[PDB]
Amino acid sequence: QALQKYSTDLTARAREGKLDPVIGRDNEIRRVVQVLSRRTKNNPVLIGEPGVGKTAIVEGLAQRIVAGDVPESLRDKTIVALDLGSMEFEERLKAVLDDIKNSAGQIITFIDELHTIVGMIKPMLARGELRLVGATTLDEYRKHIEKDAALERRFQQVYVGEPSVEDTIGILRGLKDRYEVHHGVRITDSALVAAATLSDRYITARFLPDKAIDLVDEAASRLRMEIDKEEVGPDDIADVVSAWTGIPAGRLLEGETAKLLRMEDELGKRVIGQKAAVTAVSDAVRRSRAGVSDPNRPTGAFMFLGPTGVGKTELAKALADFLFDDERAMVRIDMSEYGEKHTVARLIGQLTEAVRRRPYTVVLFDEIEKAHPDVFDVLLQVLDEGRLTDGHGRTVDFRNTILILTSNLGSGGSAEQVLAAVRATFKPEFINRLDDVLIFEGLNPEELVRIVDIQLAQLGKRLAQRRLQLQVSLPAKRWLAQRGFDPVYGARPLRRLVQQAIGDQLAKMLLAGQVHDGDTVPVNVSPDADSL
Amino acid sequence: QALQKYSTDLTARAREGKLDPVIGRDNEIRRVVQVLSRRTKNNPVLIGEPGVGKTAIVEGLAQRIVAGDVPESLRDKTIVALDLGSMEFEERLKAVLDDIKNSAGQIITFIDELHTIVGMIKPMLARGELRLVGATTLDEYRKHIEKDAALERRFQQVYVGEPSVEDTIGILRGLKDRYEVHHGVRITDSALVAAATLSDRYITARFLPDKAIDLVDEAASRLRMEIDKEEVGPDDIADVVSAWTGIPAGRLLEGETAKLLRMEDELGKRVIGQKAAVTAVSDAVRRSRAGVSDPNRPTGAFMFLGPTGVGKTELAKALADFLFDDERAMVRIDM
């Protein structure tokens, strides 16, 4: 009788249909019924990454008990959900345990989020009297419970993994009716495919099904606001995923075959030349979207190097541009700081807990020369297996990210002077695990004019606040090429040449008068410098 | 009936015109109406740096409800502002919650400054019965609420950012009539541009619109003192921003193209020579006031070095002299 005062009653709420219907997952329900009906030590624990549905399994168990699909010795045993917040203390707990044990096993207790239970129940668990069902996250478990190894021997870990898209479409078709009643709007199953398809290539921070329910909910709310078009559709889902995450401007809907047909030429609008090392980067993407890729390997793990000032960092930020519609959603770590043997621990982690959220980001590794040859040992099982560990004991899978390695070794080797210098620092067990080692060339003064066009278009887009168009003639536009010189420092001194020629006198003539908004500022070739 | 004794009633004060008119910000009002009318977990939280107007949004919502521009299932639902200072304790709180739940959702509760609520409402929030609107500062939130992550899952963060000058001019044109009645003086819209323009390059400690209302208020008060010139103007605004912060003496009126035309030669009255390294410092200021600067970069980040005893610290205190009219308003850290 004392459990009336310190508990809810899920069976009493289930007997009036006040629970959301649980669709899917026969295996976990059968596993819970298998574990909960053994003789001794009969108390499972649900464990998984958050959001995949763990309360939903216990509510589905309550639905299946009240329906009656269970075996014989599980029928009509109410699930009394306990508390520890609402609950002299030791007297109260002993009264609760005495009231449970006084019954004939007719009660299944349910402590949700039992990682707070650490802060006298220990002999009662192992004898087998009180049946206990729980739910933890995977990473509060190893911090609060696995520290206390006397307790955790008396449980049964039931892992729950996230589904794929194909089951989520069925879940969304199941739960369609509940939101149409609360918000008085109709929902079309044409949009219900897109709200799960499009929520995987864009929102890569949370886990699955709960993320693909917030879109339907917020779209229905926006439609109720507009009805303050009588049904939702595939456009308002895109409106929500634009206005949140600001992805609308970043590649408004993409990922078709019309795109991937033009990728060697679409990427050329920001990288000029280097043609033999775009036809290979443009190939590990097409063969991974056709389904020919090796299912236990990263989709592409290749290392390109060469002289400086060539475009080897600009390329690895340009192929992260149409995959993500942004340029800051990539894992950019810099190994120019790991000179000693004990900076392994900052990524084993800073590398780890930025992938496990959204397992699709491209990863940089800038200037891998300066790392001591101990960081390569950490990197060795990243390649060719795809998994590493950390303190909590989880094996994070790098099976579908695009690793990219940069270097500057040799920097001017003829044909094999640059290639045999790689063999000095890298042990042959690391050169073997890579893909095709790409060499960038220098730059040709024939292919150096168009970089000036790109730079001046960039400076034109910088002055969009002032609406300040500027006119550049072709003799000046080829005058800037000839000071682009001395192929040791690459195209980088051109981007100081532009700010020494145009930007100085423009910045002086901008803040003293005679240049205002909407005006046109032409440049003209004075016999040495550039005039205004 | 118990809410009569532990609450105010903003709707009852709004029904006699006793609230200052709320002008601007359609987006936040539409966002609050969107969040407050969902099915479950329907309780927003307004969050922003202080002074940008967060009570003003809830008072604008009350104005828009009493007017009637809302949708159908938000009409005639009074906003009863609760308290926790004026409020045996658990009995009293359960009486309040029972009185709220006894209605049919006809009441929108309003706990202002809800970061004191930590020190039994937890099941009532997630079911969706009591509608709750709040307002925290951005930096008391992460100290009092984000420590207690079971609570903060049941809210909806609605960020509110400060406006620019262009909307503040409209706000000041809106609220011009209210101070002309309390202080019996006229206010000229010529000065009303300057009281927002000049309050951005000088007073850089508080945030926006509330800072540009104190100048109009204290200027009207000084003019009432002198009438103990029949209207305020662009001079007394400058008098206030002189007498407070002592900026009046430090450059009487800062800004213009006549100034920035002479900056390589005006700066030479305190630094002699070094001519090739004043024509570059005098360039990151002119190109940043013309609008050619890169909008995501500091306007100038340059490093100068050399031998000792040359003037490399005297220069960096001389270009902080005509921008600020002082020489001590700079962030001088020493590494």
mmCIF file of C-alpha atoms in Angstrom, chain A residues 462-463 507 510-512, chain B residues 257 260 283 286-287 290:
data_model
loop_
_atom_site.group_PDB
_atom_site.id
_atom_site.type_symbol
_atom_site.label_atom_id
_atom_site.label_comp_id
_atom_site.label_asym_id
_atom_site.label_seq_id
_atom_site.Cartn_x
_atom_site.Cartn_y
_atom_site.Cartn_z
ATOM 1 C CA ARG A 462 33.804 41.922 -50.091
ATOM 2 C CA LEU A 463 32.565 45.416 -50.989
ATOM 3 C CA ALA A 507 41.637 52.691 -48.257
ATOM 4 C CA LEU A 510 37.659 55.777 -48.953
ATOM 5 C CA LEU A 511 37.765 57.530 -45.572
ATOM 6 C CA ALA A 512 38.617 61.099 -46.627
ATOM 7 C CA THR B 257 35.711 63.397 -43.444
ATOM 8 C CA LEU B 260 40.129 61.697 -41.697
ATOM 9 C CA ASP B 283 45.285 53.472 -43.856
ATOM 10 C CA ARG B 286 40.439 55.115 -43.729
ATOM 11 C CA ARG B 287 39.691 51.848 -45.503
ATOM 12 C CA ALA B 290 34.939 53.701 -46.407
#
